Amino acid sequence: TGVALEQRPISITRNAKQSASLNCKILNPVSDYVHWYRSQEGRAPERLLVYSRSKSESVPDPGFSADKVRAYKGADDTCRLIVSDLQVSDSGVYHCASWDGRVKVFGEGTRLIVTESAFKKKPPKPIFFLPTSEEIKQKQSGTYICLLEDFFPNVVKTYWKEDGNSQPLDAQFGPITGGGNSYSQVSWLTVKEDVLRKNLTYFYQHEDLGMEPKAFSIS
Amino acid sequence: VKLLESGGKVTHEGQSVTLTCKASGFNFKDYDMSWHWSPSGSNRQLVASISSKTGSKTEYKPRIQGRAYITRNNEANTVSLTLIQLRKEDSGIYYCAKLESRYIIREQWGNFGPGTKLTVLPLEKTLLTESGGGTYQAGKTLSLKCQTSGFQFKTSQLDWYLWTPGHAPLWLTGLNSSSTDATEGRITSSREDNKNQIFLQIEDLGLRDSGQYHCARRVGNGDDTDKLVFGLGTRVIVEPRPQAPLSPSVFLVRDQNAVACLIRNFYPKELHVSLTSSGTLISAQNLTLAPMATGTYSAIHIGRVGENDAITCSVKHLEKEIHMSHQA
Numbered sequence: 001t002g003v004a005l006e007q008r009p010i011s012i013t014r015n016a017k018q019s020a021s022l023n024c025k026i027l028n029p030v031s032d033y034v035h036w037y038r039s040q041e042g043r044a045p046e047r048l049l050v051y052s053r054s055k056s057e058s059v060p061d062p063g064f065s066a067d068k069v070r071a072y073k074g075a076d077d078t079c080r081l082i083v084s085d086l087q088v089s090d091s092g093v094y095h096c097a098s099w100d101g102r103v104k105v106f107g108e109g110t111r112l113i114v115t116e117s118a119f120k121k122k123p124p125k126p127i128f129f130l131p132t133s134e135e136i137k138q139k140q141s142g143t144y145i146c147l148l149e150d151f152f153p154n155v156v157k158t159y160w161k162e163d164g165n166s167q168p169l170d171a172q173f174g175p176i177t178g179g180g181n182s183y184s185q186v187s188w189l190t191v192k193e194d195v196l197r198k199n200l201t202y203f204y205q206h207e208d209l210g211m212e213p214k215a216f217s218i219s
Numbered sequence: 220v221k222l223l224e225s226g227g228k229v230t231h232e233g234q235s236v237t238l239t240c241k242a243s244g245f246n247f248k249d250y251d252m253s254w255h256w257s258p259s260g261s262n263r264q265l266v267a268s269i270s271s272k273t274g275s276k277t278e279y280k281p282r283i284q285g286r287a288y289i290t291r292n293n294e295a296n297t298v299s300l301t302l303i304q305l306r307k308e309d310s311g312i313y314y315c316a317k318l319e320s321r322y323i324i325r326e327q328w329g330n331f332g333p334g335t336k337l338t339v340l341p342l343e344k345t346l347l348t349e350s351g352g353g354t355y356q357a358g359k360t361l362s363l364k365c366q367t368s369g370f371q372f373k374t375s376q377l378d379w380y381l382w383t384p385g386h387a388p389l390w391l392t393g394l395n396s397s398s399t400d401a402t403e404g405r406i407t408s409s410r411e412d413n414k415n416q417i418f419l420q421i422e423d424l425g426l427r428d429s430g431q432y433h434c435a436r437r438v439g440n441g442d443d444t445d446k447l448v449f450g451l452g453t454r455v456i457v458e459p460r461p462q463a464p465l466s467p468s469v470f471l472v473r474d475q476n477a478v479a480c481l482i483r484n485f486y487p488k489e490l491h492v493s494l495t496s497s498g499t500l501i502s503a504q505n506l507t508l509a510p511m512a513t514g515t516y517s518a519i520h521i522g523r524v525g526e527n528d529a530i531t532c533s534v535k536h537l538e539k540e541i542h543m544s545h546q547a
């Protein structure tokens with residue numbers, strides 16, 4: 001493969017009749033085309049438009065008008081989708097996609113939330129729990145716990161890493177619980193004795209933080 | 220005066236729609252009515268016109284000549300209906316107008332309203348019906364199926380994609396007009412040319428194999444502009460396989476504002492956890508249960524209390540019973 005799609009940010013919250021811009025950074029691009037698929041709750045995923053690079057031409061699919069969805073050039077490697085005059089029926093998860101021969105590669109997606117209600121957009125507030133000596137004694141392993149609480153919207157992306165390995169560790173994530181203007185998520189990571197006393201780092205991405213992730217250093 | 224058109228809806232290509240228009244404030248009989256259509260904004264085109272007082276001259280435009288029928292209800296109403304040849308390109312905003320001089324020429328049709336939103340969606344001829352979803356124990360073999368309809372199955376390219384919330388859609392395996400594609404080992408696909416079906420076969424199921432499985436069809440012109448047509452998909456949940464009952468390890472952590480009760484490596488998943496301060500339940504406490512890759516379950520019960528407080532986590536995960544208490 002080798003193709004990599006990057007979509008920032010993870011979520012976009014707007015009121016009706018506003019506009020939204022979604023980014024798709026393509027690394028090592030094989031195809032000249034960027035496809036934009038939409039995932040809505042209850043219906044099958046479908047493609048909205050196909051954007052031609054080097055032509056800067058957005059071709060929408062049947063059922064979608066160019067005055068509603070249109071892609072443009074962002075940076076010199078970014079495809080920028082703009083969805084204008086937002087209605088509630090525009091809410092969904094928007095994935096960009098590129099062909100790699102016979103297989104099609106997708107991005108992690110960007111959730112578009114269009115509500116007819118006033119919203120607050122508050123960032124996650126983390127509290128951490130460090131491993132106890134009792135657990136290291138009777139399990140030969142330590143458990144780190146992170147609780148992100150009181151954030152809006154209900155879209156967050158968290159991951160754990162080890163200082164020097166560029167691949168997130170295998171941790172457990174709970175569901176995003178909450179309602180109204182306050183949502184929470186818990187996540188924990190268990191590591192062994194030979195992995196303990198190694199500087200860890202914890203990341204979380206939220207809409208109220210921009211495109212860069214917030215980082216936390218743990219020892 | 221006041222023209223209010225009231226019709227239009229979200230339908231699919233090959234449906235019927237009947238548009239109404241309430242006319243109030245003038246002598247309905249004397250004047251003729253008409254219907255207009257605009258793709259998205261302006262450029263209203265005269266598509267239908269009806270004569271005076273349930274008249275005799277109803278003239279349609281070549282756009283809807285053989286699938287339209289305009290009528291009027293003299294109790295303040297005008298009706299225009301499009302037949303089942305209703306495509307997606309005759310979709311937009313429809314307006315209602317009333318006709319209303321030698322040296323002073325006026326516009327023939329006037330008194331438009333806000334229009335009515337009619338959105339006809341296209342109807343896909345590619346039908347894909349996934350089946351075989353449910354809950355599976357780990358280590359079992361998953362076998363999904365797709366009933367395909369409406370296209371040449373033999374020379375088609377059909378794939379299986381895994382959709383999981385928070386993850387990028389992932390291609391598992393597929394088929395084309397040749398031999399096996401990525402069909403060695405865990406993830407496998409096959410086909411039945413007689414019944415126009417494609418199958419997925421995943422062996423040694425793991426917890427990571429949960430998600431929404433869609434079989435997809437590649438349609439287009441054969442270049443990188445082709446699209447994938449997906450079905451609704453079928454949901455697959457993976458449970459840990461049955462094993463010996465294992466009692467959990469309970470631990471208690473603090474963060475000067477909250478309390479975490481850590482319950483590790485128990486089976487079955489049924490347990491009861493409760494956080495008490497002084498014999499009473501604490502302010503907030505929400506449980507989070509998740510199965511581990513080791514085959515057992517873990518749980519975390521978080522709550523909030525002060526640092527200079529006594530708290531007790533009570534865990535009941537069998538006949539057995541466990542209490543963890545921090546004094547003040």
Ligand SMILES: *[C@@H]1O[C@H](CO)[C@@H](O[C@@H]2O[C@H](CO)[C@@H](O[C@@H]3O[C@H](CO)[C@@H](O)[C@H](O)[C@@H]3O)[C@H](O)[C@H]2NC(C)=O)[C@H](O)[C@H]1NC(C)=O
Pocket residue numbers: 001101102394395396397399400401
């Ligand atoms: C029908 O499906 C088969 C199987 O998917 C296709 O054959 C496979 O084609 C891919 C590329 O399209 C080959 O993989 C390539 O390998 C190179 C070298 O590592 C890599 O740089 C490429 O990115 C790509 O991964 C693969 O070898 C080949 N055979 C397999 C998978 O068994 C075939 O092209 C499809 N179409 C037909 C037959 O018309």
Ligand SMILES: *[C@@H]1O[C@H](CO)[C@@H](O)[C@H](O)[C@H]1NC(C)=O
Pocket residue numbers: 199219
């Ligand atoms: C881990 O962090 C501590 C900070 O106190 C630092 O002294 C140590 O060098 C770090 N470990 C590595 C491997 O850099």
Ligand SMILES: *[C@@H]1O[C@H](CO)[C@@H](O)[C@H](O)[C@H]1NC(C)=O
Pocket residue numbers: 149178184477503504505521522523
């Ligand atoms: C438990 O859920 C409630 C729901 O209102 C929430 O307010 C509370 O913050 C949650 N507990 C923790 C420790 O975040």
